[PDB]
Amino acid sequence: IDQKEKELIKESWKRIEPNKNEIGLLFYANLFKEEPTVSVLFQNPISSQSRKLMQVLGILVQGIDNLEGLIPTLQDLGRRHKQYGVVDSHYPLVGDCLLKSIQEYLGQGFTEEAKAAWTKVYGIAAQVMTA
Amino acid sequence: IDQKEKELIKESWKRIEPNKNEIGLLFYANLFKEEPTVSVLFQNPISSQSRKLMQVLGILVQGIDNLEGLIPTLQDLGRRHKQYGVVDSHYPLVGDCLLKSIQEYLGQGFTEEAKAAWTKVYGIAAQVMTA
Numbered sequence: 001i002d003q004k005e006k007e008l009i010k011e012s013w014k015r016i017e018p019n020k021n022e023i024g025l026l027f028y029a030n031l032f033k034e035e036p037t038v039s040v041l042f043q044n045p046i047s048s049q050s051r052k053l054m055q056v057l058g059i060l061v062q063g064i065d066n067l068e069g070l071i072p073t074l075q076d077l078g079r080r081h082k083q084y085g086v087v088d089s090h091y092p093l094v095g096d097c098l099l100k101s102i103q104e105y106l107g108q109g110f111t112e113e114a115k116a117a118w119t120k121v122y123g124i125a126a127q128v129m130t131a
Numbered sequence: 132i133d134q135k136e137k138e139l140i141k142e143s144w145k146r147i148e149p150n151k152n153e154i155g156l157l158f159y160a161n162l163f164k165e166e167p168t169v170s171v172l173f174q175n176p177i178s179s180q181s182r183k184l185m186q187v188l189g190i191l192v193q194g195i196d197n198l199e200g201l202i203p204t205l206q207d208l209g210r211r212h213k214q215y216g217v218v219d220s221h222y223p224l225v226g227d228c229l230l231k232s233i234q235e236y237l238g239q240g241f242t243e244e245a246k247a248a249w250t251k252v253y254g255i256a257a258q259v260m261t262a
């Protein structure tokens with residue numbers, strides 16, 4: 001993750017953040033449509049789950065200049081995900097759905113370059129969570 | 132619906148409307164989780180579908196004093212729904228999911244009385260769409 005990618009993440013978060021409630025919920029609607037077998041894993045209210053997911057994305061943006069500082073947080077999260085029935089092959093599916101949902105909601109407000117940067121950041125977060 | 136119910140629809144819409152995008156999207160997430168097979172009927176972007184659904188709810192509120200006047204509009208909507216592959220048994224499922232999603236997003240901000248009014252209004256709308 002180079003300086004340019006870090007900037008694109010900070011810059012695009014300024015448009016994601018004000019829209020984060022909708023983006024998170026759109027993500028879950030899209031996920032449950034696209035991957036009908038993962039919805040059974042979610043046991044708590046989706047409204048609160050969406051808030052939790054977007055909160056963590058904001059933490060990734062806040063720590064984007066030093067992600068290594070987030071390895072422990074992410075390792076704990078990955079551990080809980082195993083307890084939720086999540087498996088390694090879920091991560092690419094969730095990543096694609098999240099990025100596509102941001103793209104859908106923001107349209108021309110979200111560049112291909114920003115999409116690529118978020119893809120790398122997601123890939124990193126997922127690698128840390130799956131060890 | 133009676134006068135008190137009309138007033139409840141109008142007053143509770145003041146809380147639903149500013150949150151209508153989120154409620155719509157939560158509704159689709161909840162619907163797709165409750166009945167995963169139903170998602171195949173939805174071919175267009177969920178973000179735009181949620182907007183359209185909540186637009187019609189706003190029309191129901193706008194016309195709440197004279198629902199009779201919306202019968203043609205609802206009949207046309209019901210006709211298009213038949214084309215989508217929607218059938219009678221879908222209606223209770225969707226109503227339950229919609230009401231529960233409004234309740235979930237607003238919590239105690241959605242009063243028992245308002246929820247009872249909206250339940251009746253949904254039933255009337257469904258009845259007209261399927262007559």
Ligand code: HEM
Binds near residue numbers: 049
């Ligand atoms: C970088 C990727 C991801 C992030 C940042 C993330 C974030 C979160 C957060 C913050 C929570 C709240 C609970 C907790 O903190 O332990 C959560 C719960 C959950 N996540 Fe993820 N997640 C990711 C990937 C995934 C994947 C790939 C799946 C696969 C389906 C998934 C499914 C779930 C489930 C089932 C729960 C528990 C829901 C419940 O409370 O019942 N997540 N996730």
Ligand code: HEM
Binds near residue numbers: 217223
């Ligand atoms: C009062 C109840 C309902 C309302 C107000 C409503 C509203 C709408 C609206 C405004 C649209 C946009 C397209 C159009 O105007 O024809 C739509 C599309 C659609 N609705 Fe409904 N609807 C209701 C019930 C249902 C039910 C019970 C189902 C069962 C699954 C359903 C499934 C669909 C589908 C599959 C589409 C098309 C999606 C697409 O274009 O890909 N709706 N609905």
